[PDB]
Design a protein around this ligand. Sequence first.
Ligand SMILES: C/C1=C\[C@H](C)C[C@H](C)OC(=O)C[C@H](c2ccc(O)cc2)NC(=O)[C@@H](Cc2c(Br)[nH]c3ccccc23)N(C)C(=O)[C@H](C)NC(=O)[C@@H](C)C1
Ligand SMILES: Nc1ncnc2c1ncn2[C@@H]1O[C@H](COP(=O)(O)OP(=O)(O)O)[C@@H](O)[C@H]1O
Ligand SMILES: Nc1ncnc2c1ncn2[C@@H]1O[C@H](COP(=O)(O)OP(=O)(O)O)[C@@H](O)[C@H]1O
Ligand SMILES: Nc1ncnc2c1ncn2[C@@H]1O[C@H](COP(=O)(O)OP(=O)(O)O)[C@@H](O)[C@H]1O
Ligand SMILES: Nc1ncnc2c1ncn2[C@@H]1O[C@H](COP(=O)(O)OP(=O)(O)O)[C@@H](O)[C@H]1O
Ligand SMILES: Nc1ncnc2c1ncn2[C@@H]1O[C@H](COP(=O)(O)OP(=O)(O)O)[C@@H](O)[C@H]1O
Ligand SMILES: [Mg+2]
Ligand SMILES: [Mg+2]
Ligand SMILES: [Mg+2]
Ligand SMILES: [Mg+2]
Ligand SMILES: [Mg+2]
Lengths: 372, 372, 372, 372, 372
Amino acid sequence: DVQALVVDNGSGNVKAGVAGDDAPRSVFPSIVGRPKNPGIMVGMEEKDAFVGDEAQTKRGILTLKYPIEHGIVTNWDDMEKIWHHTFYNELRAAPEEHPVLLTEAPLNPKGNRERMTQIMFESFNVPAMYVAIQAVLSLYSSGRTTGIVLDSGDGVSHTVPIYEGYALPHAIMRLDLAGRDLTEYLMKILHERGYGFSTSAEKEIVRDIKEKLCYIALNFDEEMKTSEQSSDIEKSYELPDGNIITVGNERFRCPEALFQPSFLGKEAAGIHTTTFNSIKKCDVDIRKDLYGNIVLSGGTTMYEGIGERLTRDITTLAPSTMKIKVVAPPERKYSVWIGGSILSSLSTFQQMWITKEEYDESGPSIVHRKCF
Amino acid sequence: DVQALVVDNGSGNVKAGVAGDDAPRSVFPSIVGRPKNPGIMVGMEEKDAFVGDEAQTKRGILTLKYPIEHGIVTNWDDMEKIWHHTFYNELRAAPEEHPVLLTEAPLNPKGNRERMTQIMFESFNVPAMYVAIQAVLSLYSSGRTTGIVLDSGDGVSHTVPIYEGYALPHAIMRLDLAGRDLTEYLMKILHERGYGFSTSAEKEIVRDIKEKLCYIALNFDEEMKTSEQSSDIEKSYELPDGNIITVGNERFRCPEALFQPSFLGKEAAGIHTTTFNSIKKCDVDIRKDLYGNIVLSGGTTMYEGIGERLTRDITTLAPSTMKIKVVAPPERKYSVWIGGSILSSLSTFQQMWITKEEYDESGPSIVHRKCF
Amino acid sequence: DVQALVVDNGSGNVKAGVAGDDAPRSVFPSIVGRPKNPGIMVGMEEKDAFVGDEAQTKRGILTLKYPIEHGIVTNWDDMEKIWHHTFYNELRAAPEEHPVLLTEAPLNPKGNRERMTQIMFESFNVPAMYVAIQAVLSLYSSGRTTGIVLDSGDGVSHTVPIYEGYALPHAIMRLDLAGRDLTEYLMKILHERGYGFSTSAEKEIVRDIKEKLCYIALNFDEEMKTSEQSSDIEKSYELPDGNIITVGNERFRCPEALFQPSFLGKEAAGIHTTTFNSIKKCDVDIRKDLYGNIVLSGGTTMYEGIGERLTRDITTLAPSTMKIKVVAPPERKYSVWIGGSILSSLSTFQQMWITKEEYDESGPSIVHRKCF
Amino acid sequence: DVQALVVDNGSGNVKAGVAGDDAPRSVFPSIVGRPKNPGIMVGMEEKDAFVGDEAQTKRGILTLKYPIEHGIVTNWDDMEKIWHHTFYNELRAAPEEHPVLLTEAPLNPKGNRERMTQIMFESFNVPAMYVAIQAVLSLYSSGRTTGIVLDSGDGVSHTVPIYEGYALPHAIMRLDLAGRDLTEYLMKILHERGYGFSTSAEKEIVRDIKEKLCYIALNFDEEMKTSEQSSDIEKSYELPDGNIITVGNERFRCPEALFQPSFLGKEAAGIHTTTFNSIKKCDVDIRKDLYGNIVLSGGTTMYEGIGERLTRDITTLAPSTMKIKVVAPPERKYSVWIGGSILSSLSTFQQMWITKEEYDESGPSIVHRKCF
Amino acid sequence: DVQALVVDNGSGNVKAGVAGDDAPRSVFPSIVGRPKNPGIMVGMEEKDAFVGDEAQTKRGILTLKYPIEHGIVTNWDDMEKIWHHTFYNELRAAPEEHPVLLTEAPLNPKGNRERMTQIMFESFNVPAMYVAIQAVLSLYSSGRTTGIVLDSGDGVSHTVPIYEGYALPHAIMRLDLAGRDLTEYLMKILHERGYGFSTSAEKEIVRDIKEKLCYIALNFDEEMKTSEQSSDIEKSYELPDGNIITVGNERFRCPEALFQPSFLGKEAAGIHTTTFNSIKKCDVDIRKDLYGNIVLSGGTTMYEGIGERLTRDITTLAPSTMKIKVVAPPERKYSVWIGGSILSSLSTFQQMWITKEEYDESGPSIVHRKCF
Ligand SMILES: C/C1=C\[C@H](C)C[C@H](C)OC(=O)C[C@H](c2ccc(O)cc2)NC(=O)[C@@H](Cc2c(Br)[nH]c3ccccc23)N(C)C(=O)[C@H](C)NC(=O)[C@@H](C)C1
Ligand SMILES: Nc1ncnc2c1ncn2[C@@H]1O[C@H](COP(=O)(O)OP(=O)(O)O)[C@@H](O)[C@H]1O
Ligand SMILES: Nc1ncnc2c1ncn2[C@@H]1O[C@H](COP(=O)(O)OP(=O)(O)O)[C@@H](O)[C@H]1O
Ligand SMILES: Nc1ncnc2c1ncn2[C@@H]1O[C@H](COP(=O)(O)OP(=O)(O)O)[C@@H](O)[C@H]1O
Ligand SMILES: Nc1ncnc2c1ncn2[C@@H]1O[C@H](COP(=O)(O)OP(=O)(O)O)[C@@H](O)[C@H]1O
Ligand SMILES: Nc1ncnc2c1ncn2[C@@H]1O[C@H](COP(=O)(O)OP(=O)(O)O)[C@@H](O)[C@H]1O
Ligand SMILES: [Mg+2]
Ligand SMILES: [Mg+2]
Ligand SMILES: [Mg+2]
Ligand SMILES: [Mg+2]
Ligand SMILES: [Mg+2]
């Protein structure tokens, strides 16, 4: 039949493509930029707002804003611009002719889903629609039916355990601590070396510093003493204007906040304790199979050395006779989109779409009893 | 001739096979499981209910229920599922071509037999049928014609005396105290060490703890005083998730309730007093031969040290010049099935089958005239 | 003789006072708080831990922890702080010159009693001591000698039937589901309207929302269909910082989990089914008098409309000719303490105390011989 | 006793004195002037550099430079001259006999504070030393233990919330926009009337014009229309050589950049939004007491009409039931020095000084361990 | 439609022409001359004032005055004479039939623009008018949309950065040091060789000496030693009356005041430091494109060797990995006029003219609304 469009709306990036492929076609940041200075050259291309990668190339004269925060849309006018840009400029496919599969985080407010369905049916005029959960799609991509998925992107961290294809909804955990908080913490602790970043366009520089120079230590208190002894911890970075900076402790002190959220001033547990508590809220007869298939998903799980640290911590938390195995596949930054592409092409799935007739009959509230 | 199918329906397990063998082919628990969570992975096998060993393998997501309680069927819709599973999946033999031999406990209501015969003739379309008493089949298996059989399984304890092939029906006794009450009592007294079991799937763990660590003391008070002296009474057990527990007095305090039913809050005599009272309701000229052949059968008689305790107690109750002998054969957990297999293959038994013609002529009430 | 001190140690609150009064003098929460930030103003009070009502007043800079969970002490060092605070700051009475009466839930582990007795004799140097069951003190307060008490506080729900002063210990039931689970369930389902509570200090706000806006419906399904029709179900609440929230279905969906524990993901029966099963494990001659004196006790029974719902459900379960009567007295939140005050002042009770001489002679194990 | 010396080093002025007084003795500008012309009269007193008030009296033949910019020292050789002038010419007290208390802004680089400690111990040979935060001293002076202090001087604007004596370090915010930027902006917008200021001495003249004629409007957009109607907005000013200038809109357009930083071309939020965002990063249970005590401190908060404007803006941002109270006391240009004088005289403080022995033992890095 | 008249009013010269050409038609000095002696020959022409090139031919009997100084008009009666001469004698085109495009320096007083618009609408009766910035027209002429323009003529030096067609107004810098100051400095230092010029007509001779014999050194301190070693530096010049003078160091000491304004007794930075500071006030993401398109404009940039010196100095100031490229076009003395001619002929520009109707409606203050 006709192929579907798979759109993964994250807090940081937008992953989009066509169902049946092995990778998404379009990946661009979810930002909307507006000029802060006046234009004076007659004959230029005057535009009110810039979207996506165009806002990244000319961020020097723009103010940057994210419409999504912690998985929740906070500005629907900019979200609609981003979706228009995705449909007509990046994929170049009419949404009136394809069914659209969307994603969302668990334990979200219901108005988010309802507004999403309403916009998709009344603004873009799609034939069919569906909203899935991101970690479930990650497990679809993994190829298994039993495991606990740890998903961490830019806004939300969450764990979802599943056994033999059955959901354990009372065991779902959610943590509002992700890559954006780590970028802000790094920007804050860079002030100790004498480096100041304040604006929106310098936050994009700090994020690249983080993605290029940060790693996870196997034991924090020992690295805090081994690095203080020599200078082989220090690395250099060249700014867009030719200046050079050097970073030391900040390379591993920044992602340590995933395991000790009190560096940020948050009364919350790390990701290892959250995964352990999510496993312990399941029945005693299924914990043995969850300990062996801990699955990593998202961009924030791509630090160097995260699997060994997680294995060591959960091994310390768990009994001595269990076998803990964390699986960190390559290309796990796109596993949600890959799982959604796999799901939307099954022959048994073609009866779960929300169609235009059911929407005209019942309104936007049907998403609560058809998509879960 | 055409061989028969022998089906021993217990409260706890099903024993099935073909007449002429020395052991039953299929032994599985008599449970029906139903999922309590929603299934979310598209492409899975969506079953409504699980039966037998499959319900035991995935009990972590299921609610377990027994259709038989105290030898009486309390849910016929699930009993029909269990019988279908027994005929078509375990034995893989058409019941339309073999006569079926069923079992039952003595002193049961008549509606049980009538519903059983009606289902066997109208749902499975058997050619012939028969319902026997379990303790009599146990003596068929023993190879003797004189003795008193003490049968104890999961729901019912009963004694039946027989003298040279003749029934003594006024001396049959029945006790509603068996392995399931002992499992519940162990689960109740485990709270003293700080262990809490509540669900249907944890009861199956408590039952295995009981079958692996419990034993019968020769003298209860001296054992209670001796165990308090040292720690050589304590054993260890590993839970399905790697945790370790330790049990002490509970090892012999749990099956002591077979002899002192007041631990459970019941006004009833132990099994030794019941066997004695059953012997004493016989004629004075027969008691000498019953004292010398006391036969044990069933799963609840498999405790270590039960024969010596029973011999000691009955010797104390009986006159000094009688010779008490308890016989506990190995494989006494299948002696009912073995005796039924023996009975269904005798050449003189082939005229006692209830035929389809007699059923169509008189209805399901013929079970009271052709069986006893 | 000298008066006694009555201390009711619950999971949520401490009730303390002197024997002979009609109400306890000190009621404060059972919490220990520790600062999570550094103190910088020189000249301030440097306290390491805050107990009781002082931890509630400054919960903004503290992490709150409960030392008791499900009626079982999990941190004895904090329990010792709470008892010190109770004896020296609230009542201001020397425990060296008063006998102390403590309480406990039924079916607890034995170490919980032994450690309590050891602390009371070795740390506070009391002359005498006693440990009683709470649901029995509730009936002492009721003034009767026959009835079944349903006690429900913050940690444990339990029922105890008693007939003319005689215990029926084989019919005691226990359910690990109380007000704290309902607070957590309300906090979980508030996410649907867009409200996020995560820390220990926000849990204390959710608990107050529950105690101010929740009620029990007579029929759940008709209420779910009726509330969806209009907006007269919605109520407003003002947060400590001036924000306003509004709640709908959550008002009666939260306490419905007392009757349908599957909302929480638990395989267990409601309180009505548990009371019925507790009455049915008694003798047929005593059930008629238990159906007529169902007594309510505890904080979780203070919901508006619980007596009528319980009467309706137990009427549906019981035979048609029985007269079911639920008695819900005012001031039933202090009935355990009132019953203890009554018991400790009887002249016949003055020989049941555990004295210092017996403890020095036999150790902490005497609590299993002199108490029950 | 031996009293301490309290030295408040700002970007604009030096405040110095002796601990125990109610006002600082010496207040002079933090400038170092050098002659730009040759000296020709034989017999004059030749000097290489002029410091403090002498550089202001003869600024006609000098080039003026500030060694401190945005709270960070950019030229240590001139900082040493200023400290020598402060110790030997203004206070006339040997630093070898008194302990010295210094100040600093929050979120500064560490090398700044380390150089301060090193110079104070190796150049001036002090017995003891300490470095505090300015906004905390302002609250010491205010006499409270709860509030948020908005400090604004010549280089840095910062807010620090404090509750019941406890620091909330994750909610500290820093803004690089203060009086010097306002002086430069007024100098830039005076070109519209035809007045041109370029040099350092003319910059001092412009700063004096700003301190004498500028004020804050309650509503900017209405003030821009009311002033365009008449000429009652215009004031006159006499230059050092007898010329007369007149200023209009610039009286309230210049300090409006504190609330709209885009007049300067900065992507940053005003002081009202910064105070609000600093309050909102605290816990919900603490905000009510911070709204009620907002403390102003520094020279840049001395504009007429700042309290009413700040109250109106924060009222607009906050919920309608909160009570916002801004407190702006007289002498708030010296409140940092007064708070430091109070702190350095407490008896409980005499164990927090960094001593010469600890410095010889550990080096300059002990300031990160003993100070915060 | 009708073509426009482009008039570039500099401090030194007037550039005029018609829109659509590649070079201006009329270039004459902006001078007004009045006779200082009596005319005695009867029959001569009795003029009261001479304008333009005629005042240059007979400067021997005239006093010469400039009406414009540092970009500001200081005598409007002579300005009207110069404009009348430009319109009726040089171009010979009626201003009543053509729209007029004027130019101005940035950061000028507003009365200048207002008086220009008033005179153009009330004295010459133009249909439309517009006032542009000179440095922006230079970039219009260069053909780019990104760069920083260094414009230096006779009165003012200024730098304007532009990125992708957007203005950066907070980074505009202005320096009151240009060719006229260099002429006065050369006239002053020529006194060392024995040459004395005092009058206006001799200042016009010193300007020609400067334009014919001055050049910029690559390194000043080394030229001051290399030239001291020989006479190859000496050049000769013939005065209007036949005398011969010779110049040495003055050839490169005179234009060295552009890079060291302290030769003139001025507290200001050179042009290289001013350009660097104007680049550093832009955002870090833009500086890379401004370093590579530094554009020169005006007559004071026509010295031999200025591009290499500017490149060397900016390279020394900038980081080592940036690529600095100064572009010095031939015919850069008319690039402002060429850019204005290009601008006034675009089809999109024909709606930005200030027309007679808007002026009659709003007065001369509309120049602040329609021109930026
Ligand atoms: C990091 C960057 C450039 C850098 C200048 C690149 C170079 C290579 O680093 C230095 O030169 C280190 C030096 C420094 C100064 C003192 C010291 O003991 C150690 C280092 N730091 C400085 O000059 C500080 C002073 C400062 C201002 Br004002 N407010 C701040 C707020 C917090 C912290 C410090 C400050 N400074 C000018 C900045 O941060 C500026 C605003 N930052 C940028 O433009 C960003 C976009 C790129
Ligand atoms: N190599 C890397 N190492 C560490 N973090 C990374 C890396 N690459 C991306 N990230 C972080 O991952 C986040 C984006 O992950 P993604 O899963 O695409 O976000 P979302 O799905 O929420 O849009 C960014 O905040 C970025 O900082
Ligand atoms: N080794 C053992 N020791 C003690 N009890 C056992 C043992 N094996 C099984 N049982 C008990 O015997 C019961 C099953 O006995 P069985 O004869 O199968 O009963 P039924 O015929 O009613 O199914 C179970 O309740 C189990 O607890
Ligand atoms: N008015 C009320 N309505 C409903 N629940 C209440 C009310 N008051 C208190 N509760 C609940 O009762 C619990 C405390 O009950 P209580 O029996 O005093 O505690 P404890 O378990 O310590 O004895 C708390 O969890 C609280 O949520
Ligand atoms: N009356 C006033 N009104 C407005 N601003 C003032 C006034 N007096 C001083 N200022 C400004 O305060 C600044 C110095 O304040 P202060 O806080 O003492 O400086 P520092 O940053 O050195 O502590 C100067 O920039 C000055 O412009
Ligand atoms: N070849 C040259 N070399 C150096 N300076 C020159 C040269 N030609 C003209 N100038 C200087 O340029 C100035 C006039 O330049 P111009 O840009 O036309 O002035 P404006 O635009 O201000 O009218 C005069 O002061 C003159 O000294
Ligand atoms: Mg994602
Ligand atoms: Mg059996
Ligand atoms: Mg209680
Ligand atoms: Mg200050
Ligand atoms: Mg010019």
